[PDB]
Amino acid sequence: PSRLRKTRKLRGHVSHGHGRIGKHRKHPGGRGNAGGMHHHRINFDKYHPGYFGKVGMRHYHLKRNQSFCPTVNLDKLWTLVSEQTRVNAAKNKTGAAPIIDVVRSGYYKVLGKGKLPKQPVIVKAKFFSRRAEEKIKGVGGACVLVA
Amino acid sequence: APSRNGMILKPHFHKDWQRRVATWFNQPARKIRRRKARQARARRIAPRPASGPLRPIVRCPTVRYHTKVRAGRGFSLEELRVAGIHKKVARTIGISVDPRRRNKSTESLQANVQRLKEYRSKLVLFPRKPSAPKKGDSSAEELKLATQLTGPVMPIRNVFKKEKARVITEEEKNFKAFASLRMARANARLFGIRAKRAKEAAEQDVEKKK
RNA sequence: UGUUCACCCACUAAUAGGGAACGUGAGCUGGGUUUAGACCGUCGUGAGACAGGUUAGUUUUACCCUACUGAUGAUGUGUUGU
RNA sequence: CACGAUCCUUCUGACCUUUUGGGUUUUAAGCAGGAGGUGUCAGAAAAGUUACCACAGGGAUAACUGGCUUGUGGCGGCCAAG
RNA sequence: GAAUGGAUGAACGAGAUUCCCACUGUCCCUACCUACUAUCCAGCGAAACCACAGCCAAGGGAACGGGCUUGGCGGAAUCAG
RNA sequence: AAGCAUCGCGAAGGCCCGCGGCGGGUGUUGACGCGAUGUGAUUUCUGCCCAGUGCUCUGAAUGUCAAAGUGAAGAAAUUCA
RNA sequence: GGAGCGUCGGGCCCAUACCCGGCCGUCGCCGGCAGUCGAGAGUGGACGGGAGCGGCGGGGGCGGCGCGCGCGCGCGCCCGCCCCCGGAGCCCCGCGGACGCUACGCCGCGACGAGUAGGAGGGCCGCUGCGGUGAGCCUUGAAGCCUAGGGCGCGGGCCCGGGUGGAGCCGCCGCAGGUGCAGAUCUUGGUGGUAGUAGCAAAUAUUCAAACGAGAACUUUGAAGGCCGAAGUGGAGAAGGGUU
RNA sequence: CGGCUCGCUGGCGUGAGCCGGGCGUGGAAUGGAGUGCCUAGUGGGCCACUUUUGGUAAGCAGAACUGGCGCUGCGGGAUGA
RNA sequence: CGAAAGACUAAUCGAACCAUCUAGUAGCUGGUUCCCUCCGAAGUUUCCCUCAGGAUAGCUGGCGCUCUCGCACACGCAGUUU
RNA sequence: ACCCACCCGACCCGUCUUGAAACACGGACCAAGGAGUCUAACACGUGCGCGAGUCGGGGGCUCGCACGAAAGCCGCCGUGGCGCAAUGAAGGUGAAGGCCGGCGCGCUCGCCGGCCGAGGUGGGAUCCCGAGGCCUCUCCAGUCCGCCGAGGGCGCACCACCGGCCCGUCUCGCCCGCCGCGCCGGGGAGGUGGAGCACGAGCGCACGUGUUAGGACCCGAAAGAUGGUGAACUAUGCCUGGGC
RNA sequence: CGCGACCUCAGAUCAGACGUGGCGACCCGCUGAAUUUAAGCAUAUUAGUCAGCGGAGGAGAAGAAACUAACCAGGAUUCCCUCAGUAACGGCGAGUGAACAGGGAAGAGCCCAGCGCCGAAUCCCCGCCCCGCGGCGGGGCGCGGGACAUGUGGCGUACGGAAGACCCGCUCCCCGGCGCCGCUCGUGGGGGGCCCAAGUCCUUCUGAUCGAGGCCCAGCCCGUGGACGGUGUGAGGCCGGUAGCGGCCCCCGGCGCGCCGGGCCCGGGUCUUCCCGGAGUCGGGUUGCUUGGGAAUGCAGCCCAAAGCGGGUGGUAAACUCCAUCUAAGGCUAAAUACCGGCACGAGACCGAUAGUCAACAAGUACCGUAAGGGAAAGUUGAAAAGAACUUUGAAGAGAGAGUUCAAGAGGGCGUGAAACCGUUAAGAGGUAAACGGGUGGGGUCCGCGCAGUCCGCCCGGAGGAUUCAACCCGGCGGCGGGUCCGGCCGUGUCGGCGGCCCGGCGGAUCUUUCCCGCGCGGGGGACCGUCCCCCGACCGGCGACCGGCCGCCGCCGGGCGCAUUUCCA
Numbered sequence A: 001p002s003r004l005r006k007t008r009k010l011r012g013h014v015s016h017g018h019g020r021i022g023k024h025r026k027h028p029g030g031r032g033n034a035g036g037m038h039h040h041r042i043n044f045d046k047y048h049p050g051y052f053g054k055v056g057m058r059h060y061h062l063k064r065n066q067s068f069c070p071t072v073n074l075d076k077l078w079t080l081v082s083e084q085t086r087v088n089a090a091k092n093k094t095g096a097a098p099i100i101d102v103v104r105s106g107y108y109k110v111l112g113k114g115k116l117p118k119q120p121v122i123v124k125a126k127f128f129s130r131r132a133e134e135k136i137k138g139v140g141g142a143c144v145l146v147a
Numbered sequence B: 001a002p003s004r005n006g007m008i009l010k011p012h013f014h015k016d017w018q019r020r021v022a023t024w025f026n027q028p029a030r031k032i033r034r035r036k037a038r039q040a041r042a043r044r045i046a047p048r049p050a051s052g053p054l055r056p057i058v059r060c061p062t063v064r065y066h067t068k069v070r071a072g073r074g075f076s077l078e079e080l081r082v083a084g085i086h087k088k089v090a091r092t093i094g095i096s097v098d099p100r101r102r103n104k105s106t107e108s109l110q111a112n113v114q115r116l117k118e119y120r121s122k123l124v125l126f127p128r129k130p131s132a133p134k135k136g137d138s139s140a141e142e143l144k145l146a147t148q149l150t151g152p153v154m155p156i157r158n159v160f161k162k163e164k165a166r167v168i169t170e171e172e173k174n175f176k177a178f179a180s181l182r183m184a185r186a187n188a189r190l191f192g193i194r195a196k197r198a199k200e201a202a203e204q205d206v207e208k209k210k
Numbered sequence C: 001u002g003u004u005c006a007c008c009c010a011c012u013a014a015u016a017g018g019g020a021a022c023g024u025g026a027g028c029u030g031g032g033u034u035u036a037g038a039c040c041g042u043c044g045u046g047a048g049a050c051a052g053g054u055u056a057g058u059u060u061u062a063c064c065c066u067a068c069u070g071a072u073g074a075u076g077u078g079u080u081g082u
Numbered sequence D: 001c002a003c004g005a006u007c008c009u010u011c012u013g014a015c016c017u018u019u020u021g022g023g024u025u026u027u028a029a030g031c032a033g034g035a036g037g038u039g040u041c042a043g044a045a046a047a048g049u050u051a052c053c054a055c056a057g058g059g060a061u062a063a064c065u066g067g068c069u070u071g072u073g074g075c076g077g078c079c080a081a082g
Numbered sequence E: 001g002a003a004u005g006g007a008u009g010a011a012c013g014a015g016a017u018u019c020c021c022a023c024u025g026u027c028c029c030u031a032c033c034u035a036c037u038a039u040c041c042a043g044c045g046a047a048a049c050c051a052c053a054g055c056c057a058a059g060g061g062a063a064c065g066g067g068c069u070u071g072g073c074g075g076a077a078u079c080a081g
Numbered sequence F: 001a002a003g004c005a006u007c008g009c010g011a012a013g014g015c016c017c018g019c020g021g022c023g024g025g026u027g028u029u030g031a032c033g034c035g036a037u038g039u040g041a042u043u044u045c046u047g048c049c050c051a052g053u054g055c056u057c058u059g060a061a062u063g064u065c066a067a068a069g070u071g072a073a074g075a076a077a078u079u080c081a
Numbered sequence G: 001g002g003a004g005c006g007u008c009g010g011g012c013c014c015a016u017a018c019c020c021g022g023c024c025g026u027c028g029c030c031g032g033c034a035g036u037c038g039a040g041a042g043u044g045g046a047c048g049g050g051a052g053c054g055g056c057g058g059g060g061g062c063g064g065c066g067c068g069c070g071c072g073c074g075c076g077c078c079c080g081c082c083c084c085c086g087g088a089g090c091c092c093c094g095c096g097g098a099c100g101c102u103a104c105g106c107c108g109c110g111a112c113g114a115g116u117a118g119g120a121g122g123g124c125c126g127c128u129g130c131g132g133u134g135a136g137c138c139u140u141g142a143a144g145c146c147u148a149g150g151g152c153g154c155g156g157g158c159c160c161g162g163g164u165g166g167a168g169c170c171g172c173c174g175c176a177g178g179u180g181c182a183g184a185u186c187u188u189g190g191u192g193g194u195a196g197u198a199g200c201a202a203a204u205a206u207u208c209a210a211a212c213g214a215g216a217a218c219u220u221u222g223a224a225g226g227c228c229g230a231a232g233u234g235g236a237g238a239a240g241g242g243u244u
Numbered sequence H: 001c002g003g004c005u006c007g008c009u010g011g012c013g014u015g016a017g018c019c020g021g022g023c024g025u026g027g028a029a030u031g032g033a034g035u036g037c038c039u040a041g042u043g044g045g046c047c048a049c050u051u052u053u054g055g056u057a058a059g060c061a062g063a064a065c066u067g068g069c070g071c072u073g074c075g076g077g078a079u080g081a
Numbered sequence I: 001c002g003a004a005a006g007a008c009u010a011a012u013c014g015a016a017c018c019a020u021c022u023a024g025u026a027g028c029u030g031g032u033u034c035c036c037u038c039c040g041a042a043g044u045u046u047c048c049c050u051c052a053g054g055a056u057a058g059c060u061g062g063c064g065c066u067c068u069c070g071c072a073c074a075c076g077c078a079g080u081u082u
Numbered sequence J: 001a002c003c004c005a006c007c008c009g010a011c012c013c014g015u016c017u018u019g020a021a022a023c024a025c026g027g028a029c030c031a032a033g034g035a036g037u038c039u040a041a042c043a044c045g046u047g048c049g050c051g052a053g054u055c056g057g058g059g060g061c062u063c064g065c066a067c068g069a070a071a072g073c074c075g076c077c078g079u080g081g082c083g084c085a086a087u088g089a090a091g092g093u094g095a096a097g098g099c100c101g102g103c104g105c106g107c108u109c110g111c112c113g114g115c116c117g118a119g120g121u122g123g124g125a126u127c128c129c130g131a132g133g134c135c136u137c138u139c140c141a142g143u144c145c146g147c148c149g150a151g152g153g154c155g156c157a158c159c160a161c162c163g164g165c166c167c168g169u170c171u172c173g174c175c176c177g178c179c180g181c182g183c184c185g186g187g188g189a190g191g192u193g194g195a196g197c198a199c200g201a202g203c204g205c206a207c208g209u210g211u212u213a214g215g216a217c218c219c220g221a222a223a224g225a226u227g228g229u230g231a232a233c234u235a236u237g238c239c240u241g242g243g244c
Numbered sequence K: 001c002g003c004g005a006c007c008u009c010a011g012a013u014c015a016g017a018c019g020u021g022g023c024g025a026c027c028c029g030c031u032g033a034a035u036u037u038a039a040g041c042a043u044a045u046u047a048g049u050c051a052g053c054g055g056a057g058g059a060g061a062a063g064a065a066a067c068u069a070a071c072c073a074g075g076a077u078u079c080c081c082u083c084a085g086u087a088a089c090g091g092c093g094a095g096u097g098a099a100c101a102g103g104g105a106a107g108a109g110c111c112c113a114g115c116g117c118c119g120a121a122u123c124c125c126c127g128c129c130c131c132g133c134g135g136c137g138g139g140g141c142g143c144g145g146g147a148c149a150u151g152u153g154g155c156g157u158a159c160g161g162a163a164g165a166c167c168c169g170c171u172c173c174c175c176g177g178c179g180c181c182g183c184u185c186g187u188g189g190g191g192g193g194c195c196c197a198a199g200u201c202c203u204u205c206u207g208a209u210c211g212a213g214g215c216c217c218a219g220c221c222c223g224u225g226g227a228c229g230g231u232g233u234g235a236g237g238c239c240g241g242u243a244g245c246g247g248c249c250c251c252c253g254g255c256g257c258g259c260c261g262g263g264c265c266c267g268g269g270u271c272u273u274c275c276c277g278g279a280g281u282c283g284g285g286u287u288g289c290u291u292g293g294g295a296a297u298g299c300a301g302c303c304c305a306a307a308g309c310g311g312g313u314g315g316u317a318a319a320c321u322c323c324a325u326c327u328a329a330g331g332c333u334a335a336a337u338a339c340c341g342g343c344a345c346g347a348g349a350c351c352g353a354u355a356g357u358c359a360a361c362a363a364g365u366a367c368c369g370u371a372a373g374g375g376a377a378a379g380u381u382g383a384a385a386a387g388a389a390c391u392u393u394g395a396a397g398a399g400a401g402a403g404u405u406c407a408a409g410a411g412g413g414c415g416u417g418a419a420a421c422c423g424u425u426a427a428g429a430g431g432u433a434a435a436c437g438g439g440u441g442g443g444g445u446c447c448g449c450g451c452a453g454u455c456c457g458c459c460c461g462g463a464g465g466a467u468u469c470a471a472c473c474c475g476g477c478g479g480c481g482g483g484u485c486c487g488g489c490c491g492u493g494u495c496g497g498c499g500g501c502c503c504g505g506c507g508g509a510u511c512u513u514u515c516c517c518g519c520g521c522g523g524g525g526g527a528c529c530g531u532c533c534c535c536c537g538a539c540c541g542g543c544g545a546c547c548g549g550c551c552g553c554c555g556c557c558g559g560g561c562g563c564a565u566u567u568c569c570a
């Protein structure tokens, strides 16, 4: 909608909202990210601290699928399974504890955020955090490593 | 000239990009053209599967995909050999055959064999003439279907095995997983130098004798 | 002497001083400054430089308005002349 | 008051990390602190000339006039030692 | 200041100066004459330039106004200059 | 411009062209020639300066001086000679 | 004998300032109104027993919290009632509620209103095209154009009358943009003033008659006077032109 | 006021931090406050009172303070930032 | 190409013309199109091969939110003063 | 609104400028054209849909497309993007705490049972409780309805502060673990770096403003490069003619 | 000094073939800038980009791993999404910048050299016959030539292959012709041709209607046809068309059957014995360019220059070592993909003659330039030419009458005909250039009036005329509202039926393989849980979700009511 834009209101007015002292000249700064080190220095070093300079190790032929390791927090571990596993348990009276294969639902690591409900679980995962393990043990469960 | 906070961003419009803009007003006509072509091929290959040939079950590479399973390119030669299908002939009955696939694990092999077995069972080989010789199926299984198979022939569904709620033996409770991983990590890390120290120690024991 | 300025001769009553966009280039002139050519000296490795000297080097338009100069005319006085 | 960022280099530091299919060793790359300098000192690597000259602009800026000023120049008083 | 040539030098030069003789309107100091114009008419017929325009004095003003302030004043339409 | 004076070159050469060629110009030429500079007829002269910047001559007697080649240690990249 | 100067009076003169009033807009009001009592608001109403001229016998406070239009009252007759707006008749009405109420509406009180650069809001301002919509308009005359006609709007603008013209065009709700000009020594086209002006002045020169012809300064013929003056204004070619 | 905590500090005590109670207008005058995002234009200025540096001075150059003009008309100062 | 003037090379020469790259780049000139309404600046900061430009603060506008109570029943803030 | 008169006011616009009626520039006059666009990327604001998700592409299935190159649908619905987790150069690591009882010497350290479960201070719109009034035509009783409400509470969002947790890093220290007892692995206390957690707020779409990259509001160089055309002028050489 | 083989080389207007140029949107191979950005600039960037040269095709190129990876592994190329503005490059500044995996579009795989076996078993050209001949082919027959052992053909190529012995099971595939049958998806493939519904019906406007009103149901008729165009305005039905698994006629394609001529004796597994790979190439150094590729991604020149349990790769130089992974130095290959040139079509929220292409027109035209090159302007009478016969003035151009046309106030550059500018006619003014703002006045132009504008509307009182009713009941119809929820339909929350539950389905990582079927898994039952539906009773919100009676009210019609009522009129 041109109808709604500004330039429609500016018809008539001479400078077109760019002022008549300094004009709308073509490229007064320098084009683009020119002057990061000279003359636009303040902008770059109070809104992009750390832009300039190297750091860390190069790594030439990086491939992201090697380092693929999505995470799930205990917070919502039971969300992986249908409610009626969590229900048929806190029931049953065998002291069974259902299995939660985390890798099936698309997470490899089981990190430790959150309260787990007092209800035993076997959790199958690729990796665990220390605290995430400890929590499951305290609930009355068992961590299970899987390849 | 930048103004008070933003992403210091680098657009790639410094080459003559407007010379090489590729619009997409085709796409509808394209989709139609593809679908017309597809419908033609189906009509040509009369009772054959429109899909194309039957293709092997295959695991994806890399730790990421790993757990999934795809269609592959074609059945390996070892797989065909086990099924009892001559490699040159398989291509004429609608079995894909690559010969570049190795075959590492027995688990992948047998499942693929099972596939070809299944296919041969549920396939209706028309005889070369209408006057029937061996192999060619009965005129019953022929009249009842000279039908195409819409969609991929014997589709792959990446499937899981349910586990019954166990009880957790005391030993299982006992497992120190996090710790276990860390140890294992360090053993991998240190395996090589440990081995070197052992070799040094053995040399010192032998050197003591002489 | 391009000069302004200066000086000297001569006359004179006196050879006072100034201004007007340092009056006055569609008034002239262009001798001088102040393009391009060239010469000399000094300076510069050099290209080149020189309120240092020298010579050669295109000076456009008015029919508009006004101003001024002259030239017909104008309103009035009934018309016309004296 | 007596001093210097990124990048690069160099030295020092830890039974440190990485050096990519795995392992040993050189090498290299990291991490942290010094040093090698930017005096145009918040930090390009840089000589002239143009009268053969050019372009964008500038009365934000010179070379006239005209304004203000009047030191300087010119002209004129007061006082009165001579 | 010596082939970055010094010094000379007959002949020559649409070259640069100085003086003399002659000659002259260069001048004193201007005048008269001729042709072609300009001038008037018939016919034909452009252009540049143009914010609006077009009398002055002083004032103030971006510090020299046609316009503003205060005064002077102002009379159609035009011709050659 | 004649005149004067320097300089290079005896041809697998001087000077020069050309993207390239067992290419081409001088050259259908050979030092009384070709090429590169200065000065500028004649006359009369043409002083001193080789420190500077140029040019040039000589060269195991010799400081430095690259790539290769030669030796050196190293497991090798290598480093050192 | 100020229309001068210094000191001082009264009186009067007028700014877009100040005061009062109108009207427009903006801002603000926990602003008001989907239908109700109520103006320093400081209650209203069951309902039960006991009773009645009783009451709640509290400050020169000068008073607000209590008093003189009734509480009980006139009627039916000490006892009963003290009744219903489909009817009290109404200044308050709680039974139902605007002429008003497109709630993006309507209404009320205050205050305030310079503005470049710049920002924001609203435009039933305007242009062209699309989805909808107006049982829209139009040869019984569309667009456009013109108008010393009549009006509206603060304004952008708009509507009507008359004329001209001769085929299409508009209102509303949405969407979309190559959407609004005084300038750019702007671009293209057109027209002025200048102006019947400058001008049609290089190389000596024309004159008389007749003819033709609508028409002769200029054509043609004749006569005369002139020039070019064989390095020609003569007679032939080259190149170039291309039918002259 | 009452009590707890301390790895600080220390003859005992400090000092801080925590709980639990007890107490209300604490000079004048004025006004509703607080808070967060996006953000254009601007970054040539000039002038006057008073102060003030350079300069003989300047309608000069340069600072301070406030107010102006710039962005702003209107009455007056004839005329006028 | 030049008996040398930077001369000449199709009215063009201190680097011809024609087309393209090309809408070359411009901190610099010029221009930049309807109405009303409300608010309404700056020429100062530090940094910059910065001084006819940017950056950054400042000054402006817009959007808001959180609370406050003239609904007899207020806390906090100020180009003052005490 | 057409013309004319008179009094008062009144300099020509645009523009750069501290300052323009300027002896600053552009502008004779009229018509038509004529300059903030589109794409991409980001940011913040706003509207809508869904919400720990969201998403639509790309593809596919439904038609000869009249309207359709639409519309609809898809275990593709999610490969995948963005989000739901950070922090470290990296190897890696990765957000919980409290309380109670017991057992180890409660050793502000280590291990075993039960309960609560995202901490606390101040301030917080707002809810909640509410002594008490304040009347009712009488003296008391007395449920119902309000109005106000002193006083007390739970306290959103948000802010300030203090604790806590995660990752890096240092300092100090004492214990645990086992298929591999090791230059192994795991913890503790106290500082300190982090674009962290501390009962989620995103994703998609649309519109606006701003900032960029692009011809990038419009017009404007002197230049630079690539590839071609010219010696009909003129410069110089040569060939062949002519002339004095 | 002969004649004859071959080898290497010549010449032919020898016989018969091919190549040459164009086009150039897309494609392949070179070559290759500079404006530009970095606020300067040189590396970088612009950019392997414009220009330059070469060569193609309907596509090209690429392509069947000397590949990815490091997994439980994938498996030619190309294309899209994503990876990702990421890893990386970079005066680590400006800026640049991929790949693998994953999901799709498509999908197709092969052949040599060598090593070997087979009497060269092969090829080309002659010449005679039969067929076939507008893409020169088949079959036969020739002591007819040549090519070829310096290696043609069959088998065979890394997925292994060959040759042997016995295990098994059995024998259709191709082409040259000649016929003939079913016309074979936009729903009869392609092309061509010719065809196919319904008003010119009644009135009436008009210059002319395709307009306006009507026509057995918005009117008649057709409608699988109401797209578009044409026709004197606006047309489903006037005409062409449009619709239709409509018709007919030609031709051509493509596939189905028959006959002939040829070719063709073409398997698989199992055990044994043999067989095996492309050199001035890899690899190294190097210099130059190139890349995201960083102690060298790719391509080059030069120098060096290999091996065979080798060689290559395994994204940090090197040595040692294990692993993995391919097999290089020969070749072919459809498909999805590209397409501002071409031929032929379709469409548009585009432009509408200063726009849109330079070009709506006799435009790459006229014209300019020596040449390379530059490069315009320019659409519209009217329905129909009916384009003005004739008279008259004039040498004529030009007029005046006359005429055509609805109109020439449409007259051949003619639709509409703005402004600037000019002529005239009318009105008004005029010594401070004009013009302007505020305020009045004077004059004009038209516009509204009034030949009283006393403007209307209620109600009332009076005096005149006027018809019929209000009021009241009676009969009918319709509407409103109401509660008794009275009776029944209707639905919210709750409870009862466990009743739909199998006669109620989906979903579930809940269970069971006691089940069934197909091969521990898939599909289906069978339990279970969640969710959605029947039966009746009770309570409650009795809800605009409705009916039936009854009530009350309102309205309309029709009866009665004749005049102290009832409206009308002045």
Ligand SMILES: [Mg+2]
Pocket: A013
């Ligand atoms: Mg403005």
Ligand SMILES: [Mg+2]
Pocket: A017, A018, H040
């Ligand atoms: Mg702006």
Ligand SMILES: [Mg+2]
Pocket: A015, A019, A020, A023
């Ligand atoms: Mg401007």
Ligand SMILES: [Mg+2]
Pocket: A022, A023, A024, A028
């Ligand atoms: Mg600016």
Ligand SMILES: [Mg+2]
Pocket: A021, A022, H044
């Ligand atoms: Mg400025």
Ligand SMILES: [Mg+2]
Pocket: B051
């Ligand atoms: Mg497919």
Ligand SMILES: [Mg+2]
Pocket: none
């Ligand atoms: Mg002068």
Ligand SMILES: [Mg+2]
Pocket: none
């Ligand atoms: Mg003069």
Ligand SMILES: [Mg+2]
Pocket: C025, C059
């Ligand atoms: Mg002159």
Ligand SMILES: [Mg+2]
Pocket: none
């Ligand atoms: Mg002179």
Ligand SMILES: [Mg+2]
Pocket: none
């Ligand atoms: Mg000179």
Ligand SMILES: [Mg+2]
Pocket: none
């Ligand atoms: Mg004259």
Ligand SMILES: [Mg+2]
Pocket: none
């Ligand atoms: Mg290795």
Ligand SMILES: [Mg+2]
Pocket: D051
């Ligand atoms: Mg000179």
Ligand SMILES: [Mg+2]
Pocket: none
């Ligand atoms: Mg000079």
Ligand SMILES: [Mg+2]
Pocket: none
């Ligand atoms: Mg200039």
